[PDB]
Amino acid sequence: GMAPPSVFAEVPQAQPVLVFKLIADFREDPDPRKVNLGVGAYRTDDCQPWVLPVVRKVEQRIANNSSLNHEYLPILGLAEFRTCASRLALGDDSPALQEKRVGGVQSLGGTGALRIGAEFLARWYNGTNNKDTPVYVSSPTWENHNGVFTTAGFKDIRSYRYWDTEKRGLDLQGFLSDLENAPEFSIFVLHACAHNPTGTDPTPEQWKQIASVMKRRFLFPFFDSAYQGFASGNLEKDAWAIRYFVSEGFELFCAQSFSKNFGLYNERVGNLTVVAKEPDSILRVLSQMQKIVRVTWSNPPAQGARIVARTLSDPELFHEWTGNVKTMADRILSMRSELRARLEALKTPGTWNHITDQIGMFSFTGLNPKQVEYLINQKHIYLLPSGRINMCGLTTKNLDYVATSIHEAVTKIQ
Amino acid sequence: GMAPPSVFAEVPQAQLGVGAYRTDDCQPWVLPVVRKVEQRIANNSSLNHEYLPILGLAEFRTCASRLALGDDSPALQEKRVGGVQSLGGTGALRIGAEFLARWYNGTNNKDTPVYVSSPTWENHNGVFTTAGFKDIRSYRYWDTEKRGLDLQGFLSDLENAPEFSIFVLHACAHNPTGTDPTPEQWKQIASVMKRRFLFPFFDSAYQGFASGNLEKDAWAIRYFVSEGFELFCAQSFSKNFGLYNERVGNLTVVAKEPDSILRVLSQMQKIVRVTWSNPPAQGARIVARTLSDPELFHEWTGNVKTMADRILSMRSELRARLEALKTPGTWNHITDQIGMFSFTGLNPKQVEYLINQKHIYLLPSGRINMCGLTTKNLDYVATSIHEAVTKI
C-alpha cells in the first residue's frame, strides 16, 4: 500500500560550505559599519565588481560583428586563444615555444585546466593508470585542489609545509624537507604567484632552491597560475617562476585562469599549458587530452576565450588591458600599504611586514580563530576562521575602522 | 645517454556528414531570436562577470526544466524538480553519471548496468565509462531489415535487465537512426521500466528542433513523469538554440519529494565544483531571456520550426525522388524518421560508391545529416543512391 521510498532516499545532505554562510551572515547584518573581507573576487574602492574597460570594449566589437557564428569550437578550443594564453605564461621568447614543444588546452577556468591535467596524469604519467603517485599540495592551499585531484582518481594526496604561523611567512626549511622526502616522480601543485590563501610567495632565490630539489628527485611541477599580472601588475615578474622552471629544463603543466586578470569569472576561461621535452610528444599528449575533454564538456565555450584572444593578439587592446590589470594590482598594493601603516601607527603587537610582503588579493593576517570570532561577532568584520582576508574588502572609507578593530582583537582577545 | 627521459615518452597517440544545422546555402544559421537577445545583453551595462552559483543561473535552470516538463507539470507544482546548469548536453550527462556512480543503487556502485541503444551517440559509452561504470550494455533498437525500431528486441532487453539498471533513452530524434518509439511504444517501454525499477536517464538534445514542436517532442519525458518515475533528463540547447559553442545544457532531476531534490543537488554541487567550478553565463543568459519573454519565446519557436521544416522538406523531397526513380526497397523510413540524422539503410560499402565515385560523403553506418541536402544537391545525391543501390 505504501509508496516506495525514493531511489534518492539514502543520498546524504552534503556538508555545509563555510564561506557561503559567511557571506549570507554578512548580508543579514544590519550594522552600517559591516565589512566583507571574505569576498573571493576583485572589488573597487566602492565595494563593487569591476568589468574591465578593455573587456567592455571587446564585447562591443564582438556584438557588432555579425560574421561570428556559434558552431562548435575544436575539442581543444579556439586556436588563437590557446596560443596567446600559452605565450602569456611562457613569454614570447620562451625556448619551449621556439622548439615547438608546447601544447595548450582551452579549459573551463583554471579549475577545468587543473581537472583535465589531473585526469591525464592519473592515466598516462608515472605508468599507465597509476593512481598511487603522490600529489603534494601546500599547507594550506586553495580549497578545491584536493577535490580536483581526488576526483581524478589520485589516492595519496599529501601536503608540504608552507605557511609558518610564528614567522607569518614561508617555512622554507619545512618545504625543502618535504621535497627531499617526496617519492621520485611525485606531483607538486605549485602556486605560480599570489599564493591562495596566504599571499606568501617564495622569492626568486627560494624558487631556485625548490626547483633544485624537484630537478634532482624528478618531481613533476603542476603550476596553478590564477593571478598572472593581477598579483603584482607586472606580467613578466608574475610568470618568473614558471619561466625559470622551463629554462631549467623541466617538463611541466601550468593551469592558467583568466577569471581574475580579465575579471571574466563567469565566462570560465582557462588554458592548460603543457611543456614537454620533445616536440613529438605534444601531439600524443594533446590526443589524449582530447579524449578526456570529449567526455567532460565535449568542447569549450567561445565568448570568454574570444575576448581574451582578441585582447592578447592586438597591441592596442593588449596595452589597454595591461593598464587595467595594473589598476587592480595597484589598488591591492595600496590597501596592503595602508593597512600595515595603520596597524603600526596603532602600535599593534606583533610584526606586520607580512601585510606588504604578501602578494595578491588574499592575505593570511595571522589572527587566530578566537580573534576572528571577535571581529565577526563584535565588530561586524567578516573573514575566514583561518584569518584569511581579501585586501579588496578594504576601502579608503573602512580602513580606520578595520585597523582599529584588528588592534582591539590583537590586544583584547585570547 | 641522453639526459632525463621525457615523462611523456610512452604516451600513445589516441586512435552529408555534418552534425549541425545548415541553411539551403550550406551555411551556419544564428537564430534571429539569438541575435536579438545578444544585442539586448550587449546593451545592458549592468550585467557583471561575477561567478554564477555552482549550480548555475537560477532563471535559466527554472526555464530549462519548465521547457522539458511543461509549465503545468505536477512535478514542478509539487517542488520535486531540480535543475543543474551544465556544459551542454554532454556536461549534463557527465554530472548525472558521476552522481549515479556515487549515490545510486548503493554507495559507489560501479556495477549497476548502464544500457545504451544499438546504435547510439558514441559519446554515451565514453561518458558513462569515465564516470566509472564497469558494465555498459546495449539494448536492441535499430532493425536493419525493416529500417525501423526493433520493439520486440528492445522490450526483451528491458525484461532481461537486472532491476535498477540505468537506461539511457533518447527523448526524441534518436541519434543516429532518426527512429523514435511512437507514444504507444513508449507506454510499453515505460511499463517494463516501472515494473523492473529501471532508471530512465533521458538525453534530450533535440527538443522542438526534432519535429518542429517543443511540446510534442517532450511528451515521452512528461509521460514518464506522469507515471510516477524518478528520472534524469540531460538537456542540450546546442541544436534548438543553435548555441553549440556556448555550451548550454541543463540536467533536470525529478524525485518523489522535495527533500530528495535538496540532498541530490547538494551532491551535484560537489561534483560540479571539481569539474568546472561553476558554469559560463553568456549562453544561459540568452536562453533564460528567450524562454522568460513570451514574445521572444514565440519568435524562438518559429525559428525552431523553420529549421525543422527545412529538414522535413529535405526528407519529403529525398523520398519522393527516390520513389520518382523507384529505387528498389522501401523508403518510408526517410519520412517516418525524425530529426536531423537519418539511417539511410545503405551497407558499409554501398556508401563508398557514394564516397569513392560520386563523392557524397557519409558515415560507414549510412548516417546522413539531412541539413547537408539542398535544393541544389537534390539533383544528384539521390541519383547517386539510386545507382548505389542498383549497382553494388
PDB file of N, CA, C and O in Angstrom, chain B residues 233-293:
ATOM      1  N   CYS B 233      17.080  14.010 -16.843  1.00  0.00           N
ATOM      2  CA  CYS B 233      16.934  14.432 -18.235  1.00  0.00           C
ATOM      3  C   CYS B 233      18.056  15.406 -18.561  1.00  0.00           C
ATOM      4  O   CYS B 233      18.070  16.538 -18.061  1.00  0.00           O
ATOM      5  N   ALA B 234      18.999  14.967 -19.389  1.00  0.00           N
ATOM      6  CA  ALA B 234      20.118  15.805 -19.809  1.00  0.00           C
ATOM      7  C   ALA B 234      19.684  16.599 -21.036  1.00  0.00           C
ATOM      8  O   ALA B 234      19.523  16.036 -22.123  1.00  0.00           O
ATOM      9  N   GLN B 235      19.537  17.907 -20.874  1.00  0.00           N
ATOM     10  CA  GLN B 235      19.043  18.784 -21.926  1.00  0.00           C
ATOM     11  C   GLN B 235      20.195  19.547 -22.562  1.00  0.00           C
ATOM     12  O   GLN B 235      21.055  20.090 -21.862  1.00  0.00           O
ATOM     13  N   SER B 236      20.180  19.629 -23.890  1.00  0.00           N
ATOM     14  CA  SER B 236      21.103  20.473 -24.633  1.00  0.00           C
ATOM     15  C   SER B 236      20.340  21.602 -25.303  1.00  0.00           C
ATOM     16  O   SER B 236      19.229  21.401 -25.812  1.00  0.00           O
ATOM     17  N   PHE B 237      20.955  22.779 -25.333  1.00  0.00           N
ATOM     18  CA  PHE B 237      20.469  23.894 -26.128  1.00  0.00           C
ATOM     19  C   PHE B 237      21.373  24.174 -27.320  1.00  0.00           C
ATOM     20  O   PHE B 237      21.211  25.191 -27.999  1.00  0.00           O
ATOM     21  N   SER B 238      22.297  23.263 -27.609  1.00  0.00           N
ATOM     22  CA  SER B 238      23.226  23.439 -28.715  1.00  0.00           C
ATOM     23  C   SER B 238      22.516  23.489 -30.060  1.00  0.00           C
ATOM     24  O   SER B 238      22.887  24.279 -30.927  1.00  0.00           O
ATOM     25  N   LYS B 239      21.517  22.627 -30.239  1.00  0.00           N
ATOM     26  CA  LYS B 239      20.854  22.473 -31.542  1.00  0.00           C
ATOM     27  C   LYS B 239      19.618  23.324 -31.632  1.00  0.00           C
ATOM     28  O   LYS B 239      19.445  24.061 -32.601  1.00  0.00           O
ATOM     29  N   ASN B 240      18.743  23.259 -30.634  1.00  0.00           N
ATOM     30  CA  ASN B 240      17.492  24.008 -30.730  1.00  0.00           C
ATOM     31  C   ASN B 240      17.637  25.528 -30.561  1.00  0.00           C
ATOM     32  O   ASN B 240      16.749  26.264 -30.981  1.00  0.00           O
ATOM     33  N   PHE B 241      18.735  25.997 -29.955  1.00  0.00           N
ATOM     34  CA  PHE B 241      19.073  27.415 -29.972  1.00  0.00           C
ATOM     35  C   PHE B 241      20.226  27.709 -30.916  1.00  0.00           C
ATOM     36  O   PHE B 241      20.590  28.879 -31.098  1.00  0.00           O
ATOM     37  N   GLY B 242      20.805  26.678 -31.532  1.00  0.00           N
ATOM     38  CA  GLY B 242      21.989  26.887 -32.338  1.00  0.00           C
ATOM     39  C   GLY B 242      23.164  27.430 -31.560  1.00  0.00           C
ATOM     40  O   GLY B 242      24.064  28.034 -32.152  1.00  0.00           O
ATOM     41  N   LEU B 243      23.191  27.222 -30.244  1.00  0.00           N
ATOM     42  CA  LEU B 243      24.233  27.763 -29.372  1.00  0.00           C
ATOM     43  C   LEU B 243      25.354  26.765 -29.099  1.00  0.00           C
ATOM     44  O   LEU B 243      25.949  26.760 -28.013  1.00  0.00           O
ATOM     45  N   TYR B 244      25.689  25.946 -30.101  1.00  0.00           N
ATOM     46  CA  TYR B 244      26.702  24.897 -29.981  1.00  0.00           C
ATOM     47  C   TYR B 244      27.917  25.335 -29.165  1.00  0.00           C
ATOM     48  O   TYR B 244      28.292  24.682 -28.184  1.00  0.00           O
ATOM     49  N   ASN B 245      28.548  26.444 -29.557  1.00  0.00           N
ATOM     50  CA  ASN B 245      29.819  26.845 -28.961  1.00  0.00           C
ATOM     51  C   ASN B 245      29.684  27.681 -27.695  1.00  0.00           C
ATOM     52  O   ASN B 245      30.702  28.155 -27.182  1.00  0.00           O
ATOM     53  N   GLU B 246      28.480  27.853 -27.160  1.00  0.00           N
ATOM     54  CA  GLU B 246      28.354  28.456 -25.840  1.00  0.00           C
ATOM     55  C   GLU B 246      28.058  27.432 -24.752  1.00  0.00           C
ATOM     56  O   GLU B 246      27.983  27.796 -23.580  1.00  0.00           O
ATOM     57  N   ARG B 247      27.892  26.163 -25.117  1.00  0.00           N
ATOM     58  CA  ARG B 247      27.924  25.048 -24.165  1.00  0.00           C
ATOM     59  C   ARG B 247      26.837  25.179 -23.095  1.00  0.00           C
ATOM     60  O   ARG B 247      27.110  25.216 -21.893  1.00  0.00           O
ATOM     61  N   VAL B 248      25.593  25.207 -23.557  1.00  0.00           N
ATOM     62  CA  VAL B 248      24.430  25.459 -22.714  1.00  0.00           C
ATOM     63  C   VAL B 248      23.652  24.160 -22.561  1.00  0.00           C
ATOM     64  O   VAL B 248      23.075  23.654 -23.533  1.00  0.00           O
ATOM     65  N   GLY B 249      23.599  23.638 -21.332  1.00  0.00           N
ATOM     66  CA  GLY B 249      22.834  22.449 -21.037  1.00  0.00           C
ATOM     67  C   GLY B 249      22.213  22.568 -19.661  1.00  0.00           C
ATOM     68  O   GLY B 249      22.526  23.487 -18.892  1.00  0.00           O
ATOM     69  N   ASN B 250      21.332  21.620 -19.351  1.00  0.00           N
ATOM     70  CA  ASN B 250      20.711  21.575 -18.035  1.00  0.00           C
ATOM     71  C   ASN B 250      20.403  20.122 -17.717  1.00  0.00           C
ATOM     72  O   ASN B 250      19.872  19.400 -18.567  1.00  0.00           O
ATOM     73  N   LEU B 251      20.741  19.689 -16.511  1.00  0.00           N
ATOM     74  CA  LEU B 251      20.336  18.372 -16.030  1.00  0.00           C
ATOM     75  C   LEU B 251      19.102  18.558 -15.159  1.00  0.00           C
ATOM     76  O   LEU B 251      19.180  19.142 -14.070  1.00  0.00           O
ATOM     77  N   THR B 252      17.961  18.079 -15.651  1.00  0.00           N
ATOM     78  CA  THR B 252      16.726  18.091 -14.881  1.00  0.00           C
ATOM     79  C   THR B 252      16.621  16.798 -14.079  1.00  0.00           C
ATOM     80  O   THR B 252      16.843  15.704 -14.611  1.00  0.00           O
ATOM     81  N   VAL B 253      16.311  16.936 -12.796  1.00  0.00           N
ATOM     82  CA  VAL B 253      16.140  15.815 -11.883  1.00  0.00           C
ATOM     83  C   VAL B 253      14.700  15.833 -11.389  1.00  0.00           C
ATOM     84  O   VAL B 253      14.220  16.867 -10.910  1.00  0.00           O
ATOM     85  N   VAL B 254      14.020  14.694 -11.483  1.00  0.00           N
ATOM     86  CA  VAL B 254      12.674  14.532 -10.942  1.00  0.00           C
ATOM     87  C   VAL B 254      12.742  13.478  -9.846  1.00  0.00           C
ATOM     88  O   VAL B 254      13.189  12.349 -10.091  1.00  0.00           O
ATOM     89  N   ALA B 255      12.315  13.848  -8.640  1.00  0.00           N
ATOM     90  CA  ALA B 255      12.319  12.958  -7.494  1.00  0.00           C
ATOM     91  C   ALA B 255      10.911  12.822  -6.942  1.00  0.00           C
ATOM     92  O   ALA B 255       9.982  13.532  -7.338  1.00  0.00           O
ATOM     93  N   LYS B 256      10.769  11.902  -5.991  1.00  0.00           N
ATOM     94  CA  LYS B 256       9.460  11.636  -5.418  1.00  0.00           C
ATOM     95  C   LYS B 256       9.003  12.742  -4.470  1.00  0.00           C
ATOM     96  O   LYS B 256       7.796  12.892  -4.256  1.00  0.00           O
ATOM     97  N   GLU B 257       9.919  13.521  -3.900  1.00  0.00           N
ATOM     98  CA  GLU B 257       9.515  14.573  -2.972  1.00  0.00           C
ATOM     99  C   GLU B 257      10.603  15.637  -2.918  1.00  0.00           C
ATOM    100  O   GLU B 257      11.718  15.423  -3.416  1.00  0.00           O
ATOM    101  N   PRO B 258      10.299  16.818  -2.355  1.00  0.00           N
ATOM    102  CA  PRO B 258      11.251  17.938  -2.438  1.00  0.00           C
ATOM    103  C   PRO B 258      12.537  17.738  -1.660  1.00  0.00           C
ATOM    104  O   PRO B 258      13.581  18.249  -2.083  1.00  0.00           O
ATOM    105  N   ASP B 259      12.502  17.046  -0.521  1.00  0.00           N
ATOM    106  CA  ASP B 259      13.717  16.931   0.279  1.00  0.00           C
ATOM    107  C   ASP B 259      14.798  16.155  -0.460  1.00  0.00           C
ATOM    108  O   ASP B 259      15.986  16.480  -0.351  1.00  0.00           O
ATOM    109  N   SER B 260      14.408  15.136  -1.229  1.00  0.00           N
ATOM    110  CA  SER B 260      15.400  14.394  -2.001  1.00  0.00           C
ATOM    111  C   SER B 260      16.088  15.283  -3.028  1.00  0.00           C
ATOM    112  O   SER B 260      17.288  15.125  -3.288  1.00  0.00           O
ATOM    113  N   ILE B 261      15.346  16.221  -3.632  1.00  0.00           N
ATOM    114  CA  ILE B 261      15.969  17.171  -4.554  1.00  0.00           C
ATOM    115  C   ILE B 261      17.053  17.970  -3.846  1.00  0.00           C
ATOM    116  O   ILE B 261      18.151  18.163  -4.385  1.00  0.00           O
ATOM    117  N   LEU B 262      16.771  18.446  -2.633  1.00  0.00           N
ATOM    118  CA  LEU B 262      17.764  19.223  -1.898  1.00  0.00           C
ATOM    119  C   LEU B 262      19.042  18.421  -1.692  1.00  0.00           C
ATOM    120  O   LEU B 262      20.151  18.919  -1.924  1.00  0.00           O
ATOM    121  N   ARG B 263      18.905  17.163  -1.270  1.00  0.00           N
ATOM    122  CA  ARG B 263      20.085  16.354  -0.999  1.00  0.00           C
ATOM    123  C   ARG B 263      20.823  16.014  -2.289  1.00  0.00           C
ATOM    124  O   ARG B 263      22.055  16.092  -2.343  1.00  0.00           O
ATOM    125  N   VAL B 264      20.090  15.658  -3.348  1.00  0.00           N
ATOM    126  CA  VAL B 264      20.726  15.362  -4.632  1.00  0.00           C
ATOM    127  C   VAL B 264      21.507  16.572  -5.134  1.00  0.00           C
ATOM    128  O   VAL B 264      22.667  16.454  -5.554  1.00  0.00           O
ATOM    129  N   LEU B 265      20.876  17.751  -5.117  1.00  0.00           N
ATOM    130  CA  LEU B 265      21.555  18.950  -5.597  1.00  0.00           C
ATOM    131  C   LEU B 265      22.785  19.272  -4.765  1.00  0.00           C
ATOM    132  O   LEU B 265      23.779  19.773  -5.303  1.00  0.00           O
ATOM    133  N   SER B 266      22.744  18.995  -3.461  1.00  0.00           N
ATOM    134  CA  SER B 266      23.916  19.264  -2.638  1.00  0.00           C
ATOM    135  C   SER B 266      25.099  18.409  -3.069  1.00  0.00           C
ATOM    136  O   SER B 266      26.245  18.869  -3.013  1.00  0.00           O
ATOM    137  N   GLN B 267      24.843  17.174  -3.520  1.00  0.00           N
ATOM    138  CA  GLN B 267      25.915  16.333  -4.038  1.00  0.00           C
ATOM    139  C   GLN B 267      26.335  16.765  -5.438  1.00  0.00           C
ATOM    140  O   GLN B 267      27.525  16.737  -5.767  1.00  0.00           O
ATOM    141  N   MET B 268      25.363  17.155  -6.274  1.00  0.00           N
ATOM    142  CA  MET B 268      25.658  17.732  -7.586  1.00  0.00           C
ATOM    143  C   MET B 268      26.650  18.878  -7.459  1.00  0.00           C
ATOM    144  O   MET B 268      27.600  18.989  -8.243  1.00  0.00           O
ATOM    145  N   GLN B 269      26.431  19.748  -6.472  1.00  0.00           N
ATOM    146  CA  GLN B 269      27.307  20.899  -6.284  1.00  0.00           C
ATOM    147  C   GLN B 269      28.747  20.459  -6.090  1.00  0.00           C
ATOM    148  O   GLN B 269      29.667  21.061  -6.649  1.00  0.00           O
ATOM    149  N   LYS B 270      28.964  19.418  -5.285  1.00  0.00           N
ATOM    150  CA  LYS B 270      30.321  18.941  -5.053  1.00  0.00           C
ATOM    151  C   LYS B 270      30.946  18.421  -6.340  1.00  0.00           C
ATOM    152  O   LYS B 270      32.132  18.654  -6.600  1.00  0.00           O
ATOM    153  N   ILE B 271      30.159  17.714  -7.155  1.00  0.00           N
ATOM    154  CA  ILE B 271      30.641  17.184  -8.429  1.00  0.00           C
ATOM    155  C   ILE B 271      31.008  18.322  -9.380  1.00  0.00           C
ATOM    156  O   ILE B 271      32.078  18.318  -9.999  1.00  0.00           O
ATOM    157  N   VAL B 272      30.116  19.307  -9.519  1.00  0.00           N
ATOM    158  CA  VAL B 272      30.397  20.439 -10.402  1.00  0.00           C
ATOM    159  C   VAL B 272      31.650  21.181  -9.954  1.00  0.00           C
ATOM    160  O   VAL B 272      32.481  21.583 -10.779  1.00  0.00           O
ATOM    161  N   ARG B 273      31.780  21.403  -8.647  1.00  0.00           N
ATOM    162  CA  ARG B 273      32.852  22.235  -8.119  1.00  0.00           C
ATOM    163  C   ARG B 273      34.223  21.754  -8.574  1.00  0.00           C
ATOM    164  O   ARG B 273      35.105  22.566  -8.861  1.00  0.00           O
ATOM    165  N   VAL B 274      34.417  20.431  -8.643  1.00  0.00           N
ATOM    166  CA  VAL B 274      35.710  19.854  -9.008  1.00  0.00           C
ATOM    167  C   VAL B 274      35.825  19.557 -10.490  1.00  0.00           C
ATOM    168  O   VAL B 274      36.831  18.973 -10.918  1.00  0.00           O
ATOM    169  N   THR B 275      34.828  19.930 -11.286  1.00  0.00           N
ATOM    170  CA  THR B 275      34.844  19.686 -12.719  1.00  0.00           C
ATOM    171  C   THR B 275      35.029  20.985 -13.489  1.00  0.00           C
ATOM    172  O   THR B 275      36.040  21.157 -14.181  1.00  0.00           O
ATOM    173  N   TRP B 276      34.094  21.926 -13.350  1.00  0.00           N
ATOM    174  CA  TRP B 276      34.225  23.232 -13.974  1.00  0.00           C
ATOM    175  C   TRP B 276      34.003  24.391 -13.011  1.00  0.00           C
ATOM    176  O   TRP B 276      34.066  25.545 -13.445  1.00  0.00           O
ATOM    177  N   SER B 277      33.779  24.106 -11.716  1.00  0.00           N
ATOM    178  CA  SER B 277      33.611  25.075 -10.632  1.00  0.00           C
ATOM    179  C   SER B 277      32.217  25.690 -10.626  1.00  0.00           C
ATOM    180  O   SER B 277      31.487  25.590  -9.638  1.00  0.00           O
ATOM    181  N   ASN B 278      31.864  26.343 -11.728  1.00  0.00           N
ATOM    182  CA  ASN B 278      30.577  26.981 -11.953  1.00  0.00           C
ATOM    183  C   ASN B 278      30.485  27.238 -13.450  1.00  0.00           C
ATOM    184  O   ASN B 278      31.509  27.190 -14.143  1.00  0.00           O
ATOM    185  N   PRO B 279      29.289  27.412 -13.994  1.00  0.00           N
ATOM    186  CA  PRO B 279      29.135  27.353 -15.451  1.00  0.00           C
ATOM    187  C   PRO B 279      29.207  28.736 -16.079  1.00  0.00           C
ATOM    188  O   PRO B 279      29.063  29.757 -15.391  1.00  0.00           O
ATOM    189  N   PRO B 280      29.415  28.810 -17.391  1.00  0.00           N
ATOM    190  CA  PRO B 280      29.520  30.113 -18.053  1.00  0.00           C
ATOM    191  C   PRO B 280      28.155  30.781 -18.187  1.00  0.00           C
ATOM    192  O   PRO B 280      27.104  30.139 -18.151  1.00  0.00           O
ATOM    193  N   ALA B 281      28.177  32.097 -18.363  1.00  0.00           N
ATOM    194  CA  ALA B 281      26.947  32.882 -18.313  1.00  0.00           C
ATOM    195  C   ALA B 281      26.304  33.151 -19.667  1.00  0.00           C
ATOM    196  O   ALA B 281      25.074  33.171 -19.754  1.00  0.00           O
ATOM    197  N   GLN B 282      27.089  33.396 -20.716  1.00  0.00           N
ATOM    198  CA  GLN B 282      26.531  34.014 -21.921  1.00  0.00           C
ATOM    199  C   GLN B 282      25.392  33.195 -22.526  1.00  0.00           C
ATOM    200  O   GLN B 282      24.302  33.720 -22.780  1.00  0.00           O
ATOM    201  N   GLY B 283      25.622  31.912 -22.792  1.00  0.00           N
ATOM    202  CA  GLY B 283      24.592  31.124 -23.449  1.00  0.00           C
ATOM    203  C   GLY B 283      23.362  30.927 -22.585  1.00  0.00           C
ATOM    204  O   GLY B 283      22.230  31.016 -23.075  1.00  0.00           O
ATOM    205  N   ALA B 284      23.564  30.664 -21.291  1.00  0.00           N
ATOM    206  CA  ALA B 284      22.437  30.513 -20.377  1.00  0.00           C
ATOM    207  C   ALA B 284      21.635  31.805 -20.264  1.00  0.00           C
ATOM    208  O   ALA B 284      20.406  31.770 -20.142  1.00  0.00           O
ATOM    209  N   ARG B 285      22.316  32.955 -20.293  1.00  0.00           N
ATOM    210  CA  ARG B 285      21.624  34.241 -20.280  1.00  0.00           C
ATOM    211  C   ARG B 285      20.744  34.405 -21.515  1.00  0.00           C
ATOM    212  O   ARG B 285      19.622  34.922 -21.427  1.00  0.00           O
ATOM    213  N   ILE B 286      21.240  33.981 -22.678  1.00  0.00           N
ATOM    214  CA  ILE B 286      20.449  34.054 -23.904  1.00  0.00           C
ATOM    215  C   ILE B 286      19.206  33.180 -23.790  1.00  0.00           C
ATOM    216  O   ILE B 286      18.092  33.614 -24.103  1.00  0.00           O
ATOM    217  N   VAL B 287      19.378  31.936 -23.337  1.00  0.00           N
ATOM    218  CA  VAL B 287      18.249  31.018 -23.228  1.00  0.00           C
ATOM    219  C   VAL B 287      17.243  31.509 -22.198  1.00  0.00           C
ATOM    220  O   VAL B 287      16.034  31.500 -22.447  1.00  0.00           O
ATOM    221  N   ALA B 288      17.719  31.945 -21.029  1.00  0.00           N
ATOM    222  CA  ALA B 288      16.798  32.414 -19.997  1.00  0.00           C
ATOM    223  C   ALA B 288      15.991  33.612 -20.476  1.00  0.00           C
ATOM    224  O   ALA B 288      14.776  33.682 -20.249  1.00  0.00           O
ATOM    225  N   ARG B 289      16.644  34.569 -21.139  1.00  0.00           N
ATOM    226  CA  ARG B 289      15.918  35.736 -21.634  1.00  0.00           C
ATOM    227  C   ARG B 289      14.873  35.343 -22.669  1.00  0.00           C
ATOM    228  O   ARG B 289      13.754  35.873 -22.671  1.00  0.00           O
ATOM    229  N   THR B 290      15.210  34.398 -23.546  1.00  0.00           N
ATOM    230  CA  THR B 290      14.271  33.980 -24.583  1.00  0.00           C
ATOM    231  C   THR B 290      13.071  33.260 -23.985  1.00  0.00           C
ATOM    232  O   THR B 290      11.918  33.549 -24.335  1.00  0.00           O
ATOM    233  N   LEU B 291      13.323  32.304 -23.089  1.00  0.00           N
ATOM    234  CA  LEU B 291      12.245  31.478 -22.560  1.00  0.00           C
ATOM    235  C   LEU B 291      11.360  32.225 -21.572  1.00  0.00           C
ATOM    236  O   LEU B 291      10.212  31.817 -21.360  1.00  0.00           O
ATOM    237  N   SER B 292      11.852  33.308 -20.976  1.00  0.00           N
ATOM    238  CA  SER B 292      11.085  34.053 -19.989  1.00  0.00           C
ATOM    239  C   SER B 292      10.341  35.246 -20.582  1.00  0.00           C
ATOM    240  O   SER B 292       9.697  35.988 -19.834  1.00  0.00           O
ATOM    241  N   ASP B 293      10.422  35.452 -21.892  1.00  0.00           N
ATOM    242  CA  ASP B 293       9.699  36.519 -22.574  1.00  0.00           C
ATOM    243  C   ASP B 293       8.767  35.864 -23.580  1.00  0.00           C
ATOM    244  O   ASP B 293       9.247  35.259 -24.554  1.00  0.00           O
TER     245      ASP B 293
END
